[PDB]
């Protein structure tokens, strides 16, 4: 029973993904530049205020 009386409206129990080290760039030193990126694994900056974790509900609207 996946519902289990409190698991009826949220994602699977594991939530290790909430705690992740924030991504920080590498400073370019003098006399050289870091290699140009590829633009295939990047995340844009977007407004927050969206419920995450078990707060967000997953059931058809």
């Amino acid at each position: 029973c996946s519902s289990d009386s409190r698991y009826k409206r949220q994602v699977s129990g594991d939530e290790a993904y909430l705690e992740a080290a924030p991504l920080a760039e590498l400073h370019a030193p003098a006399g050289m530049i870091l290699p140009v990126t590829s633009g295939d694994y990047a995340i844009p900056v977007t407004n927050g205020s969206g419920a995450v974790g078990k707060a967000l509900d997953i059931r058809p609207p």
């Binding site: 029973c1 996946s2 519902s3 289990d4 009386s5 009826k8 994602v11 699977s12 594991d14 290790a16 993904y17 909430l18 992740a20 080290a21 924030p22 991504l23 920080a24 760039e25 590498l26 400073h27 370019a28 030193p29 006399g31 050289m32 870091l34 290699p35 140009v36 990126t37 590829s38 295939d40 694994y41 995340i43 844009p44 977007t46 407004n47 927050g48 205020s49 969206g50 419920a51 995450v52 974790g53 967000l56 997953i58 059931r59 058809p60 609207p61």
Partner: protein, 218 residues
Amino acid sequence: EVPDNPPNEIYATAQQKLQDGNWRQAITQLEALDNRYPFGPYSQQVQLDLIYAYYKNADLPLAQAAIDRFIRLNPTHPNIDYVMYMRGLTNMALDDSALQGFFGVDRSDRDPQHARAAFSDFSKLVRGYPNSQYTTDATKRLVFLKDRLAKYEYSVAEYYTERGAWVAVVNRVEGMLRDYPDTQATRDALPLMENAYRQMQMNAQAEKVAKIIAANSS
């Protein structure tokens, strides 16, 4: 099994069964309703509820096909963001075994074929619908998947460094630096590139990596 009833009461009792929490009865009723009247008003609702029932019941192989069919047949549905989020969530949940995590072993250097698909789907959702109610969770999962892929590549580079294949580790770390130049994995993997450049006596090239790690030592 199921009776030959009009969609009203069968749909109502399927909803009641799902609200109770018994997934098997709900999935059987929804399958019967979809196979009975695959033209009626409830078809979209039937599919959107079948996806949820598949995901909760741990039937991801069928869920992926159902999501693909729904997104293909309705490329302009008002709630495509929900189905995209469900696809990106089931692809990521397929990457966990629920038994390895009991002992705490890191599921990072395993086969990253589902993590890449989940990252692609989450990126597609974020690009397509910036103003939805799933964007923050999608971005958090994107960051987690990026870190996981970086750690996998770092593990492969570490194995090549241990064996003594310096060209291979140089190429792997260069790929990490070109693709993932912000994750902690690259920051911890730069010394491997330093050592690999050191082994081939190419000190002139090694000084550049030394400067890279010195400028970011803080």
